[PDB]
């Protein structure tokens with residue numbers, strides 16, 4: 001046992017816990033890959049560092065000399081934020097003035113030069129500014145979590161293995177929600193390379209199931225269902241696409257807290273419902289599914305996920 005040179009040696013090597021009370025009635029088992037345990041409690045912590053580490057080894061960027069830029073409103077902002085933090089990188093994350101003031105604090109806290117755009121233009125208003133700021137900045141650098149290959153690479157070298165070596169090769173199916181598609185692909189390719197019978201089940205919002213023939217729509221399952229095929233996503237690897245609604249996802253994310261003591265984000269719930277539904281198909285008795293729980297639930301107190309219990313809060317008045 002030794003001391004890590006810095007916060008970045010702490011990335012990866014996340015734990016595997018079974019689902020007990022929620023998997024009621026399954027003939028199969030479901031192990032949860034807890035990315036919430038990542039240093040900044042998110043799976044993005046892998047692509048954040050990965051993409052930087054990579055552009056570094058390639059010699060395309062150098063601390064303070066280069067100026068990382070990146071369009072995103074989700075966790076990769078944080079995964080990048082703390083990696084740029086320890087490695088001394090000026091960072092600029094573009095996102096509409098819409099995203100909570102908290103997701104703004106967290107990056108500010110990391111010295112992230114967050115730049116807000118028109119909260120009506122959505123992602124385009126962000127990427128515009130993003131791209132803009134790039135063409136504008138001499139030594140600016142666009143990471144592009146959806147295009148960059150370091151993304152699935154990292155998953156091919158760690159998440160992939162971690163899962164394999166975790167289940168000791170007995171893994172029967174890999175369940176993952178598709179955001180940039182990096183995880184499912186990267187880690188996915190590596191398992192298939194260790195066993196072709198391994199099944200990669202893709203998960204996406206029922207309300208925005210594009211890989212199911214459906215049309216992109218808005219949903220609450222924050223973190224996946226980008227409404228399109230990220231270049232890094234290699235759909236051919238997917239053996240099946242399970243769809244889940246923002247509602248099951250939510251509910252499931254809640255049962256997870258009250259029955260497993262796993263406080264997780266709504267994307268994790270969805271990945272879990274998916275995994276349990278599969279575990280219940282008769283023909284899968286005895287099989288092992290590994291579902292990725294992408295984030296911790298504390299970074300969602302200000303979201304649809306907590307509105308319910310949130311009233312139970314402010315409302316309830318003190319007792320004497």
Ligand SMILES: CSCC[C@H](/N=C/c1c(COP(=O)(O)O)cnc(C)c1O)C(=O)O
Nearest residue numbers: 074075076178179180181182183223267294
């Ligand atoms: C729009 S999409 C988004 C993406 C990223 N993340 C990441 C994530 C995911 C995805 O994962 P992938 O591999 O598919 O990418 C999920 N969930 C969660 C919670 C998270 O954060 C960011 O944020 O940037």
